[PDB]
Amino acid sequence: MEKVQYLTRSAIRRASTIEMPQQARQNLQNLFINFCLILICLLLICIIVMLL
Amino acid sequence: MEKVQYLTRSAIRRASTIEMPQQARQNLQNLFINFCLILICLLLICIIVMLL
Amino acid sequence: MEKVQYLTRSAIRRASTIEMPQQARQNLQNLFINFCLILICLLLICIIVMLL
Amino acid sequence: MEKVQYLTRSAIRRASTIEMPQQARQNLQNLFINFCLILICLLLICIIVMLL
Amino acid sequence: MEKVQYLTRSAIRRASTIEMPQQARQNLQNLFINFCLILICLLLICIIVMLL
Numbered sequence A, B, C, D, E: 001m002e003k004v005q006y007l008t009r010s011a012i013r014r015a016s017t018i019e020m021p022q023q024a025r026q027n028l029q030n031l032f033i034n035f036c037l038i039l040i041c042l043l044l045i046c047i048i049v050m051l052l
Helices: A002-014 A025-050 B001-012 B023-052 C001-012 C024-051 D002-014 D024-051 E003-014 E024-051
Strands: none
Touching: A025 B023, A025 E024, B023 C024, C024 D024, E003 E024
């Protein structure tokens, strides 16, 4: 129980996410669009591999 | 009638959309471009499934 | 002639385009990239239909 | 020689590129990303023509 | 050893990366998104070449 509580606290303690302050929504856009494009890039590679 | 009016008010009351103030059009861009990229990603998956 | 002049003025009067001031080039980017994506999204659908 | 020098000066004089000041890297992003998207759109049309 | 240390220092000395200050995360987005799109464009060309 206390171990779980500490584990949860430890997990949160371990967890950390940081982005630009002024350019926050810019960073969020980098985080979103690149992730999508990167997924597509990787997908196209699979399309290319299959096609090959 | 009054029920409909209240329902409309309740619907509006329930409705809520929020984005970054300074980075508003950035957030709108995140909202627009990611949605379109995400659609392409999903549509590439359809192509991939159909290819497979 | 005067009718054409008024028509031109009327057309200009009817014409109106507005975007965010501070986030102008952001809005222009939304206007440009989404249009390109959205076109491709629609063009992927054409490929999907043709694939189907 | 002097003609070439003047021609170089004239070429530079003719040459002119302008983008938003505050939204410079935004404009550069519009310039880069849209160009690449536009290329993909055109290249999808080539795929579509070839699909048909 | 000292040569390696100097080489490391020289490598760092040679190494240099610069982007817009205010439009930093914008520049990082240009750096990320264009790189992905450019890769996709190049990968579409591969698809086009194969298809042809």
